[PDB]
Amino acid sequence: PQITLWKRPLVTIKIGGQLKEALLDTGADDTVIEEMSLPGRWKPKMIGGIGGFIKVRQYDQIIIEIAGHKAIGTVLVGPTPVNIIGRNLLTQIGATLNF
Amino acid sequence: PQITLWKRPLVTIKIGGQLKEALLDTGADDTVIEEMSLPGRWKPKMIGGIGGFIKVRQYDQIIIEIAGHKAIGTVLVGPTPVNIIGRNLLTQIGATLNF
Ligand SMILES: CC(C)(C)NC(=O)[C@@H]1CN(Cc2cccnc2)CCN1C[C@@H](O)C[C@@H](Cc1ccccc1)C(=O)N[C@H]1c2ccccc2C[C@H]1O
Ligand SMILES: [Cl-]
Numbered sequence: 001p002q003i004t005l006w007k008r009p010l011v012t013i014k015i016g017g018q019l020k021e022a023l024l025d026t027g028a029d030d031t032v033i034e035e036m037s038l039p040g041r042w043k044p045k046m047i048g049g050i051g052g053f054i055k056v057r058q059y060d061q062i063i064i065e066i067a068g069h070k071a072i073g074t075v076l077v078g079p080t081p082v083n084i085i086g087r088n089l090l091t092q093i094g095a096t097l098n099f
Numbered sequence: 100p101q102i103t104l105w106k107r108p109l110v111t112i113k114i115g116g117q118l119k120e121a122l123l124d125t126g127a128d129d130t131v132i133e134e135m136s137l138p139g140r141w142k143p144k145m146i147g148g149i150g151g152f153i154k155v156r157q158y159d160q161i162i163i164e165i166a167g168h169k170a171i172g173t174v175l176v177g178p179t180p181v182n183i184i185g186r187n188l189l190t191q192i193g194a195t196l197n198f
């Protein structure tokens with residue numbers, strides 16, 4: 001689809017068997033989801049936002065369906081105020097910014 | 100252009116006669132620039148992201164060029180970690196996300 005930017009570009013995702021709303025975020029290097037369980041091993045990470053850093057758990061090789069499009073990649077889980085689809089997964093669904 | 104997301108979507112902007120690097124950020128509601136001088140009066144604003152909030156100075160009706168495209172709109176100034184072009188100006192220049 002073509003998504004305009006008049007409002008936040010929120011879409012439905014499926015991750016870990018769960019449906020969530022998430023933001024398509026070209027400024028985000030990484031994908032960051034609110035607290036949930038994911039399978040496999042994880043390691044801690046600190047990631048930096050405009051207001052400082054938060055501690056997250058990093059899970060690799062996680063499948064996500066983003067507005068109907070499947071992708072696999074690293075997903076960070078922690079106390080993010082909104083669920084964020086970052087560039088590591090936007091690339092996989094073929095998302096571009098156009099003007 | 101059509102900008103892919105394999106790398107950060109950094110572009111050159113022009114504000115106050117000077118060239119700066121800035122991030123095209125669909126996840127940002129507003130545009131916020133590192134400390135610089137802008138004309139006129141400012142209003143207070145708090146902006147929140149990952150990690151919490153920062154206090155910024157809001158300047159309205161500022162002339163700004165984004166990757167060659169002319170805009171006139173609200174620019175926030177404050178201790179942002181990187182210069183960010185958000186949706187208020189991305190809409191002005193006609194930007195969309197496409198996949
Ligand atoms: C991986 C992670 C998510 C941590 N990345 C970011 O937060 C980066 C940080 N850099 C910076 C960085 C920090 C440390 C190291 N390298 C880089 C600047 C750009 N952000 C990306 C932003 O798009 C993230 C959004 C998230 C958000 C959206 C809505 C509500 C809450 C949080 C963001 O912070 N957006 C906010 C935002 C942004 C600008 C202006 C106004 C507003 C309000 C709000 O829309
Ligand atoms: Cl990845």
Ligand SMILES: [Cl-]
Nearest residue numbers: 091094103104
């Ligand atoms: Cl591509």
